[PDB]
């Protein structure tokens, strides 16, 4: 299946408590495997899968200061942001960036992209051609100007096409064990009562990876997918991941209903009933 | 292997 | 823009009285940032919590992960309490083993 190689960078100000809290986090697939965060006691560049052993000193040491140098240029887009909305000294506002690139199976891009937000809301994003930028208000003209007579955009596309690829084949070539790996869902369903002669039906997976799954209710071979409540997929603590979906059915008919689960590890998806 | 570079808004 | 956060509190196997675990709270969908997480063992902090998977989804709202590892028994009951800027109180958010 497809990989990806993503940063995910936060900017928040705290006018009167000091300097902006800046964080980096690094995911292969939906595997966090290296961070950074400002408000450590010692700032660095930090391994958060064991695969990430592999790497040397210089790696780290050169991860590092790039974080440095990325908090600085930040704090500077802060105060500008400031200026072209017209905004006071004594409110806390927040910069996201997602920057990430794809490959197949084979390990050939597939795409790549960079997108900016301020206070939740986009700001500007590198097109699909990864050779021009897109502007969400005239704040984000102005910089997408700065960024045109800069040339930027072509900057980018080369760590895009070149860099991020190469070093997230390198990645999940050192961390095959985990990051290839396929861990099976295990289900089960869980009853609970309600006011009115109904029960809530609960189908649980658990202990997955990847976390691409899907989950359905069926009646009589149709999936009910308009009664169904659900959580999206989470993480457990330990690599893997969790989910469930449930549905409100007639007391005395629980038996009619099926779950279903569909997962990589899955040969054959799961069917599951409610058991007394 | 992170972006060394964002440059200013 | 402002987003409550929810809050999820789950194991990451079914509950077993005197088996090694591990506990979650999962806070998502939050908006502005600065937030405060505490994972609590009848009422008291656990010590050294890990907070891991800090990302955002395509509307921006924050994502992150608490978790610990605990060993439940009968008795111990386990919650999760945020303060987020959206909300006027804490919200204790108590795990439940039969859910």
């Keep these: 299946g497809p990989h990806s190689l993503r940063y995910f960078v936060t900017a928040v100000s705290r006018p009167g408590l000091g300097e902006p809290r800046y964080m980096e986090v690094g995911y292969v697939d939906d595997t966090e495997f290296v961070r950074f965060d400002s408000d450590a006691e010692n700032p660095r560049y930090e391994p958060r899968a064991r695969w990430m052993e592999q790497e040397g000193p210089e790696y780290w040491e050169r991860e590092t200061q790039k974080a440095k140098g990325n908090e600085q240029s930040f704090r500077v887009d802060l105060r500008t942001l400031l200026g072209y909305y017209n905004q006071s000294k004594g409110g806390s506002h927040t910069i996201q960036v997602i920057s990430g690139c794809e490959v197949g199976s084979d390990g050939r891009l597939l795409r790549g992209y960079q997108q900016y937000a301020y206070d939740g809301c986009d700001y500007i994003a590198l097109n699909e051609d990864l050779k021009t930028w897109t502007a969400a208000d005239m704040a984000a003209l102005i910089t997408k100007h700065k960024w045109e007579q800069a040339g930027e955009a072509e900057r980018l596309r080369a760590y895009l096409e070149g860099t991020c690829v190469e070093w997230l084949r390198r990645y999940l070539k050192n961390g095959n064990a985990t990051l290839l790996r396929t861990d099976s869902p295990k289900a089960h369903v869980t009853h609970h009562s309600r006011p009115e002669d109904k029960v809530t039906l609960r189908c649980w997976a658990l202990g997955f990876y990847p976390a691409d799954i899907t989950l359905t209710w069926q009646l009589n071979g149709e999936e009910l997918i308009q009664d169904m409540e659900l959580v999206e997929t989470r993480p457990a603590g330990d690599g893997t991941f969790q989910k469930w979906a449930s549905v409100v059915v007639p007391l005395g008919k629980e038996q009619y209903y099926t779950c279903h689960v569909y997962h990589q590890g899955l040969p054959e998806p799961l069917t599951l009933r409610w058991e007394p | ?9 | 823009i402002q987003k409550t956060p929810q809050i999820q509190v789950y194991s990451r196997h079914p509950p077993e009285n005197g088996k090694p675990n591990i506990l979650n709270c999962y806070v998502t969908q939050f908006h502005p940032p600065h937030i405060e997480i505490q994972m609590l063992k009848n009422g008291k902090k656990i010590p050294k919590v890990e907070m891991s998977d800090m990302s955002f989804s395509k509307d921006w709202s924050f994502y992150i992960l608490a978790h610990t590892e605990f060993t439940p028994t009968e008795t111990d009951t386990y919650a999760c309490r945020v303060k987020h800027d959206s909300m006027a109180e804490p919200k204790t958010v108590y795990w439940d083993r039969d859910m």
């Design chain 2, 1 to 9: 292997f992170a972006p060394g570079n964002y440059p200013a808004l």
